Design a protein around this ligand. Structure first.
Ligand code: KVB
Ligand code: KVB
Length: 238
């Protein structure tokens, strides 16, 4: 019982997500192969490889948001305020989406697959990596399809409570149709489990905390002179 209008909205979202991601292929610094043991330079090269993946992701996320129906109707100031806050959360959703529970690794851009050890080997701290993997496993147990991921991202974008939002009324009104679509879609997909929808919305709660956990990781780089490139530092370093 999805209405025609809801079906159309969902098609648009899934088509946009697909196109934007394919556009992230249409060259990152390599993962260091052939390094010496305990190497300063190897570690920095790993970190640099990761910062460049993050820079690819942020561009994909902005490109996707611009395609989300209603986003560009908002004032430009609100567009920026919404994307600034949602970028890390959407990035962690797309990360969770690429977790393989069999291997316990994350695969980025098809070719780049990494373990907890590999993230640690690049200089990221256990206090950040562990909750990300915990979240990824919890996301895996939900079994979201492409429509559910796209809808959840749209809902995340139109959060009226982000810092410096000018027209929170308009933002909340834009969130409504996407919340309503996800409610309808989840009922049809799994009618016997009436909790899958609350459990999904609850992942937005966890993402808020992960953003805070991420802020602490960013801060921990300041007392080990391992700083972010300027682009990432602008959106992430307070
Ligand atoms: O834009 C492009 O064509 C390509 C591109 C894609 C990604 C990035 C880096 O990744 C991000 C992620 C979250 C937001 C922005 C961001 C934008 C970006 C933006 C654009 C349109 C609507 C909304 C947001 C614009 N202006 C910002 C400003 C300000 F002070 F206002 F100048 C401050 C802080 C962030 C921003 C950037 C930079 C470029
Ligand atoms: O694959 C596709 O098709 C699309 C796609 C392409 C790329 C990506 C993201 O790619 C990555 C890969 C490795 C790390 C990050 C990264 C994160 C995010 C993060 C952190 C730990 C583990 C997983 C993810 C957060 N913070 C970082 C910081 C910090 F200092 F903390 F600011 C520094 C450097 C990297 C990071 C990002 C997603 C989707």
């Amino acid at each position: 019982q999805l209405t025609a209008a809801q079906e159309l909205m969902i098609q648009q979202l899934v088509a946009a997500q697909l196109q934007c991601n394919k556009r992230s292929f249409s060259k990152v610094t390599p993962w260091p192969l052939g390094a010496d043991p305990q190497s300063r330079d190897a570690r920095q090269q790993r970190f640099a490889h990761f910062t460049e993946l993050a820079i690819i992701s942020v561009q994909e996320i902005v490109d996707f948001a611009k395609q989300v129906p209603g986003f560009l109707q908002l004032g430009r100031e609100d567009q920026i305020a919404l994307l600034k806050a949602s970028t890390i959360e959407i990035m962690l959703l797309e990360t969770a989406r690429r977790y393989n529970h069999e291997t316990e690794c994350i695969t980025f851009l098809k070719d780049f697959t990494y373990s907890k050890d590999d993230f640690h080997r690049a200089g990221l701290q256990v206090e950040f990596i562990n909750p990300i993997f915990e979240f990824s496993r919890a996301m895996r147990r939900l079994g979201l399809d492409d429509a559910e991921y796209a809808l959840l991202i749209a809902i995340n974008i139109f959060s009226a409570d982000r810092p410096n939002v000018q027209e929170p009324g308009r933002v909340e009104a834009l969130q409504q149709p996407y919340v309503e679509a996800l409610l309808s879609y989840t009922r049809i997909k799994r009618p016997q489990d009436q909790l899958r929808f609350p459990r999904m919305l609850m992942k937005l709660v966890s993402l808020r905390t992960l953003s805070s956990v991420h802020s602490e990781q960013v801060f921990a780089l300041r007392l080990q002179d391992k700083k972010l490139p300027p682009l990432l530092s602008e959106i992430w370093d307070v």
